[PDB]
Write a protein that binds this ligand. Structure first.
Ligand SMILES: Cc1nccc(N2CCCc3nc(C4(NC(=O)c5ccc(F)cc5)CC4)ccc32)n1
Length: 374
């Protein structure tokens, strides 16, 4: 894969070895983000954010510092807007935080809101550099509240992203085998993708240990919520000293992951085509990815179809290898519906996520119908 797309070998779509600390100029931002559970509970976060001076973004030179500054400012924006998470909400984001955040967001080509690329892909570190990428050795940089299971929720999402990296690196081999006209290399490449997607499902199983249902629904789901089609923030969030009118932006979700879309585009599973609701959302969430990663997904569509290549040739081995990738995806989609039933629906039923289930049923229905043999 080309280096311009920003896909690491082992790490994949995730940012390899992100920065923990910023430079000395951004200590006032870094204090509020590090102690975000403490300042919300005491009722002094909105006091601390309003006290800030408008720090310029010129000292953030390299890419990893800018991604850290997006994560720091993004988490502060969710904490300032939502607050304790008991109805009391802020429509106005102050100039001291909003001006540098929108300027930094415009520079990186992202919306000024916490996305999957901030809170999963950039929000991690390695405890021991010698020891490998696993949950015991890994830890998140920032959290919202105490007992929110943000460590469990974001790292298990990241580990599935890291598991998918082994499938991603062999994508060049698939398109090279089609143009060069090599059946056995194409069959070998597809079985390797199917194997890696099967292993990614076993990594997905770790979410039950590290996250609980009551913690995600009541606490962590509130902070990940955006301001697009929300009864609380109807018109949107006004960013002070940057835009005049309030601009709407959707919150964090699985659809913002490039892993969520790339294998559908590779295998010709028509998610984005056929202008339904689930199609439009997945297309909209490409702008919530980083610019290099949306270009990667878009460049997969430019290459010729793997489905039509496998369909045109009357080859049972290629069809079985193609179906192994699709069946591996259906298993991941099926398992994601079991998580949304456990972590959103059952917590919601015990109080005085229908649209999220209806989305993931439609995404799975598209994946299952794309099978050649049942
Ligand atoms: C191909 C495929 N199939 C099924 C699922 C799938 N992904 C993308 C790779 C990891 C992944 N993680 C989550 C989980 N996390 C989130 O949905 C999530 C939500 C909000 C947020 F701000 C950040 C992450 C763990 C619940 C769901 C789907 C998938 N990818």
């Amino acid at each position: 894969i080309s280096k311009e797309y920003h896909i690491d070998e082992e790490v994949g779509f995730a940012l390899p070895n992100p920065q923990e600390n910023l430079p000395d100029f951004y200590n006032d931002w870094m204090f509020i983000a590090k102690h975000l559970p403490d300042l919300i509970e005491s009722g002094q976060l909105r006091e601390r954010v309003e006290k800030l001076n408008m720090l310029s973004i010129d000292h953030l030179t390299d890419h990893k510092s800018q991604r850290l500054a997006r994560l720091v400012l993004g988490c502060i924006t969710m904490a300032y807007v939502w607050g304790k998470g008991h109805g009391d909400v802020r429509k106005v984001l102050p100039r001291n935080i909003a001006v540098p955040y929108c300027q930094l967001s415009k520079k990186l080509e992202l919306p000024p809101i916490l996305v999957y690329a901030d809170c999963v892909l950039a929000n991690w570190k390695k405890k021991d550099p010698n020891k490998p990428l696993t949950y015991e050795n890994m830890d998140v940089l920032f959290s919202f509240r105490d007992g929110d299971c943000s460590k469990g929720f974001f790292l298990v999402s990241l580990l599935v992203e890291i598991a998918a990296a082994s499938a991603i690196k062999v994508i060049p081999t698939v398109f090279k085998a089609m143009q060069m006209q090599e059946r056995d290399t194409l069959l070998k490449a597809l079985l390797e993708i199917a194997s890696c997607l099967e292993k990614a499902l076993q990594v997905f199983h770790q979410i039950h240990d590290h996250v609980n249902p009551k913690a995600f629904f009541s606490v962590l789901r509130i902070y990940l919520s955006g301001w697009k089609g929300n009864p609380q923030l109807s018109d949107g969030l006004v960013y002070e000293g940057f835009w005049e009118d309030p601009k709407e932006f959707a919150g964090g979700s699985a659809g913002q992951s490039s892993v969520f879309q790339c294998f559908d585009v590779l295998l010709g599973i028509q998610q984005t085509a056929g202008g339904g609701h689930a199609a439009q959302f997945l297309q909209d969430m490409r702008r919530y990815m980083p610019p290099a990663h949306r270009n990667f997904l878009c460049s997969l569509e430019s290459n010729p179809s793997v489905r039509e290549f496998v369909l045109s040739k009357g080859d049972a081995g290629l069809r079985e290898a193609y179906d192994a990738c699709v069946k591996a995806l259906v298993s991941l989609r099926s398992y994601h519906l079991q998580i949304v039933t456990k972590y959103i629906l059952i917590p919601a039923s015990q109080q005085p996520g229908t649209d999220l289930m209806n989305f993931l049923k439609t995404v799975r229905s598209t994946t299952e119908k794309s099978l050649l043999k049942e």
